[PDB]
Design a protein around this ligand. Structure first.
Ligand code: TTP
Ligand code: MG
Ligand code: MG
Length: 342
DNA sequence: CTAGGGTCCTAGGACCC
DNA sequence: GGGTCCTAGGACCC
């Protein structure tokens, strides 16, 4: 009863799209991200920029200190969505069992596939080659019996490569696998695990599930399972979007309600346009606002509401401004909607 | 020097039975 | 004295 799971993941996605569409950028360091003057961060960088240490989520000021010649690009999201739709269509030539996780990646369950004599290795290779042939972008892939191992494997031979983990190989692979490599084990969890002597899956294997449950709750069961190669999560294919948000960080902090209200007036039309694409009648479950202060604390306040309404979002932002700000400057204003459940 | 797009989990009181 | 809704926060993912 062993499944075959592929994880396909585009290489340096946004940057690879920009280098294809403008070959002038192929061999200089580039990154998509907000300017230093906009208090931006890097969305991603090409390999010439990564060589200097430039990474996703890095503050753009730090990126530019590491790489003074970095070319900063704003981003063309319709171009990325176009490439995304294309690779998902390519995935569909092989199976309907597709769970996209983001624009540039997806799980595929090819257990019941007849392509390539049932070879998940050869299916992954064909998909990667077809994506290069049709989009002139490269992808990496991982092949494993369960989701999380397939996703880890897709990183091990990138760019433009793949890695296969068989059941026979799972114990040796897990023994030294750092817990931080597990999707969902982030910096905070890894530091808590490290402070109790747990670094790798091999370490967690020597642990009592009951202690893990007590110390981490439901997350402790996940850690226990994953550390043994256990991951029964099915490839879904029917997941739907549950929210839409629109937020902006200002170049300077704001200190006056008039400035906040002015920012909302620009955010609202964008929220309405994006909601309408998926809910033409604007009917929703909740709406709300987000403020982020200069001490980086953030607050949200949202409430049951039947239909997108600008004045109520202003009114709510006014309350939040008056009630939870405590005289701090504000660096971000955001609007938010929770979608009806079907 | 710290984005913008999201998902998921936790947790207290409200409301219900 | 349990189940679910409402709400806020926060880790985490891309
Ligand atoms: C991680 C990350 C990605 N993104 C965007 C830009 C990425 O190109 C796109 C897909 O993310 P990833 O697949 O995580 O990264 P990548 O494609 O740029 O590089 P890699 O070859 O290592 O896979 O999502 C962000 O905007 N912010 C982020 O923090
Ligand atoms: Mg990628
Ligand atoms: Mg990806």
């Amino acid at each position: 009863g062993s499944r075959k799971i592929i994880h396909v993941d585009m290489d340096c996605f946004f940057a690879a799209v920009e280098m294809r569409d403008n070959p002038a950028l192929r061999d200089i360091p580039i990154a998509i991200g907000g300017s230093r003057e906009r208090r931006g961060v890097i969305s991603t960088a090409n390999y010439p920029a990564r060589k200097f240490g430039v990474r996703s989520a890095m503050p753009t000021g730090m990126a530019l200190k590491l790489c003074p010649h970095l070319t900063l690009l704003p981003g063309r999201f319709d171009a990325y969505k176009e490439a995304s739709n294309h690779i998902r269509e390519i995935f569909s030539r092989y199976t309907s069992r597709i769970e996209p996780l983001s624009l540039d990646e997806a799980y595929l369950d090819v257990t019941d596939s007849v392509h390539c004599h049932g070879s998940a290795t050869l299916i992954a290779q064909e998909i990667r080659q077809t994506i290069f042939n049709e989009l002139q972008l490269t992808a990496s892939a991982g092949v494993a019996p369960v989701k999380f191992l397939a996703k880890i494997a897709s990183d091990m031979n990138k760019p433009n490569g793949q890695f296969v983990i068989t059941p026979a190989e799972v114990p040796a692979f897990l023994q030294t696998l750092p817990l931080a490599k597990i999707p969902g084990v982030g910096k905070v969890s890894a530091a808590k695990l490290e402070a109790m002597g747990l670094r790798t899956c091999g370490d967690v294997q020597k642990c009592d599930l009951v202690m893990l449950l007590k110390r981490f709750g439901k997350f402790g069961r996940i850690l226990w399972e994953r550390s043994q190669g256990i991951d029964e999560r099915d490839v879904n294919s029917e997941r739907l979007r549950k929210s839409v948000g629109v937020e902006r960080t200002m170049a300077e902090d704001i200190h006056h309600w008039s400035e906040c209200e002015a920012i909302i007036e620009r955010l609202y039309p964008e929220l309405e346009r994006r909601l309408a694409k998926v809910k033409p009648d604007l009917l929703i479950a909740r709406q709300g606002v987000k403020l982020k202060f200069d001490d980086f604390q953030q607050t949200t306040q949202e409430h049951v509401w039947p239909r997108l309404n600008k004045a109520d979002l202003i009114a709510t932002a006014r309350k939040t401004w008056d009630e939870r700000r405590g005289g701090r400057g504000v660096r971000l204003v955001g609007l938010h909607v929770t979608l009806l459940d079907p």
